[PDB]
């Protein structure tokens with residue numbers, strides 16, 4: 001029997017958020033114990049500076065420019081799947097839970113989907129057998145006229161809406177959702193163990209603004225409300241790992257912990273995390289925006305308490321999971337995700353590139369110790385003056401710019417080992433620069449020459465496609481009348 | 495027999511420099527193992543933003559404002575003990591090794607002293623039995639006419655100078671000094687074990703610019719030359735701890751690892767370290783400047799792999815070390831250092847203040863989770879425009895200022911748990927501010943009212959008092975003719 005696969009994907013948790021990663025308050029004892037019992041990656045990356053594209057990248061093993069999860073409305077624009085998005089995960093894309101049933105896996109998603117809320121994009125049409133969670137974020141409350149409250153699903157149908165059946169108290173921070181998500185995880189593990197190999201995709205979002213926690217966790221953290229949620233998630237993960245040992249299935253269960261993008265610094269200090277020593281955060285292709293905590297745990301197989309400097313990608317979880325299943329990735333398409341099993345089980349290292357996209361633009365690329373920025377951007381001057389700062393307290397001259405800066409002729413290159421905070425660009429005249437420039441540009445142009453970008457899914461929005469009347473609304477008496485509208489170009493970043 | 499005391503004090507190593515503290519390259523496996531076998535402090539502080547005052551503070555258990563290691567030449571100015579300094583540690587201060595002598599200890603300093611280079615300030619006049627190292631930094635090379643190359647001592651006499659008998663190659667970064675310092679430590683431990691309780695003050699300085707490492711460590715770090723030095727020091731520390739275990743004296747040996755101030759960000763990225771998530775570094779009273787890595791290791795006594803959020807001071811090593819020897823601190827004077835043994839052995843927490851001084855000025859104070867800045871300063875506008883940046887890549891509005899800013903009447907208060915990088919001052923109108931303000935001001939007032947500052951030791955410099963002719967130069971033929979000069983006010 002192939003090993004069970006458990007993917008713990010956090011929302012907006014940064015590289016500096018775990019005790020073992022250097023968080024000063026040391027409030028993640030369970031994750032620290034996971035690290036001590038497994039392998040830790042200090043050089044691990046997501047696939048985009050925000051939620052939806054990274055989640056799509058995880059589930060396809062493919063960059064958002066291949067899987068369609070980007071916009072072309074303007075250059076280097078972050079896009080995702082809000083309630084009004086017309087597109088979503090195309091039928092042409094092959095998702096991990098779809099492929100895993102070739103080895104008899106039963107798959108469940110717990111938490112946030114973000115690959116499209118419309119009927120054709122439902123997770124149960126894309127490989128998952130079970131679902132408890134929302135297709136969208138947990139923002140609200142809405143007035144149900146300008147936009148509807150966001151639905152929570154069980155499998156095919158909604159069981160309620162956020163701020164209705166699923167209360168989130170914005171004054172106090174109280175919500176029971178992480179406890180519900182935990183119980184959904186445990187119930188599924190118990191039902192599947194010694195019956196079918198299982199894949200659990202545990203995509204919680206308590207750490208995404210507005211942040212929440214169950215009452216016993218509120219006010220327990222030295223990091224305010226954000227820390228409260230982290231302690232609750234850490235505790236929950238502890239109980240998940242304990243269940244696997246109690247059912248004597250731990251040694252046949254591979255568990256990976258990571259996050260979908262960097263800490264949301266616009267929400268710091270009370271509602272957002274830390275990116276440790278790294279520059280900026282969510283929305284940017286600086287290290288703080290795409291470098292993530294990443295732990296692997298598989299007792300009797302992954303040697304305990306080790307560290308690997310393998311350049312890792314969230315997309316590698318696709319290809320690695322297939323390898324654990326005894327399966328092969330699709331052969332009719334580019335697959336960016338690499339098989340990490342030699343790294344995980346034998347301590348091997350693979351010389352691979354990490355490409356950093358923002359929308360339609362390859363902003364940066366890392367090979368070995370070096371990173372070249374072909375483009376730089378934080379956010380526009382207009383947004384910055386309105387108080388939106390992606391890099392609070394931070395300013396690196398000619399690097400953190402409010403204009404989309406074209407460095408394609410002379411890439412800004414950093415040595416990440418010597419300069420994790422991207423503070424000191426290499427001299428253009430140096431031998432080290434020339435070597436790095438030729439090595440990285442070679443790999444980038446090979447990538448681009450082989451790339452035929454997918455059509456963008458995130459260009460079009462429609463007021464009428466919001467969650468007015470999700471399936472299951474009728475019986476609950478919760479259907480809302482949609483407004484009259486036409487599809488139109490989404491307005492990004494504003 | 496009281497337990498052995500081993501204090502490992504780094505020069506310019508930051509909070510973000512150890513793997514276990516979050517350094518991404520994870521290049522300190524021996525120190526990480528020390529942490530796993532002992533106790534880690536995430537909230538530990540030095541006593542000043544630079545070398546000499548912090549070292550004076552360690553060995554006296556007393557703030558620089560009390561022990562004399564500050565200047566009054568101007569307000570809030572960093573001062574230390576360069577070669578031209580006239581003063582140094584006064585006879586009136588009681589140093590740790592002086593006081594340990596009572597209990598049968600034999601004490602050795604290995605490495606950098608920095609408490610005065612003149613004959614009356616010699617460490618062997620101040621409680622140490624043995625010495626291998628230098629009174630000063632390892633800057634050079636000098637021409638031996640305008641400045642003399644810095645001497646290295648064995649006990650009472652110089653055995654050579656840096657860039658002469660003790661080469662430091664600035665082109666490559668090669669020097670054997672850390673290996674020599676390791677050997678000095680090992681030899682001392684072998685000699686004292688089963689004979690006398692030992693106190694070893696191991697004060698290496700390879701991580702201080704200009705950074706150096708022995709050949710086998712050069713080019714081995716992903717952090718460049720600074721990282722090479724760190725790897726060597728880490729390796730040396732592993733060998734020290736292994737010796738204590740191999741001699742079967744580990745269980746009777748208390749060892750502490752810390753640093754004297756934050757990373758020197760003027761020397762980064764090649765010759766300076768990391769302060770992790772904290773603001774600025776060396777020379778400032780922001781967290782990056784005075785928050786330090788801190789490990790305690792005492793097998794069988796300190797429970798392995800634990801973390802304590804005890805607000806700790808480098809000064810505490812004075813009082814704690816006395817408590818280890820079964821001794822009480824001086825009773826005729828204020829002592830800032832606290833006995834940390836109940837923390838170390840029983841896991842206790844003491845509600846103590848951390849005061850942050852820069853020169854003659856109390857810049858900031860931390861109580862619990864809150865830090866109040868009464869004054870802010872990085873460096874002057876003139877120095878900044880000349881390329882000196884204590885906070886590269888960093889700018890916090892109204893916080894990181896190039897003027898010495900008076901906030902005495904409305905302190906900038908930060909919640910350190912929520913905001914380690916001191917990015918978000920608390921609103922002056924909040925209830926949290928008001929509570930923190932009253933709590934912190936109370937303890938600051940109590941401190942200031944009971945304080946009579948010592949006369950400053952770091953005001954006066956004299957060209958003629960530099961190391962022209964250290965004791966031992968005559969037999970070596972290394973005495974240099976000094977210039978003519980008069981004592982004058984130092985330029986800080």
Ligand SMILES: *[C@@H]1O[C@H](CO)[C@@H](O)[C@H](O)[C@H]1NC(C)=O
Nearest residue numbers: 167168169174175176214215
């Ligand atoms: C959370 O769950 C507990 C039961 O465990 C219940 O008493 C409480 O009302 C719930 N709170 C909310 C806000 O739903």
Ligand SMILES: *[C@@H]1O[C@H](CO)[C@@H](O)[C@H](O)[C@H]1NC(C)=O
Nearest residue numbers: 394395396397398400402889
């Ligand atoms: C960042 O620093 C540069 C160089 O000193 C300066 O010109 C610029 O104004 C700074 N940017 C901001 C937003 O303060």
Ligand SMILES: *[C@@H]1O[C@H](CO)[C@@H](O)[C@H](O)[C@H]1NC(C)=O
Nearest residue numbers: 660661662663668669670708
């Ligand atoms: C360091 O010592 C080795 C022998 O152990 C010697 O070959 C080398 O020249 C020495 N280097 C310096 C700079 O003293």
Ligand SMILES: *[C@@H]1O[C@H](CO)[C@@H](O)[C@H](O)[C@H]1NC(C)=O
Nearest residue numbers: 395878888889890891892894
């Ligand atoms: C720091 O930020 C403030 C406020 O934006 C600005 O006035 C100042 O120019 C900045 N300083 C530098 C060196 O960038």
Ligand SMILES: [Ca+2]
Nearest residue numbers: 011012051260
């Ligand atoms: Ca996210």
Ligand SMILES: [Ca+2]
Nearest residue numbers: 505506545754
């Ligand atoms: Ca120092």
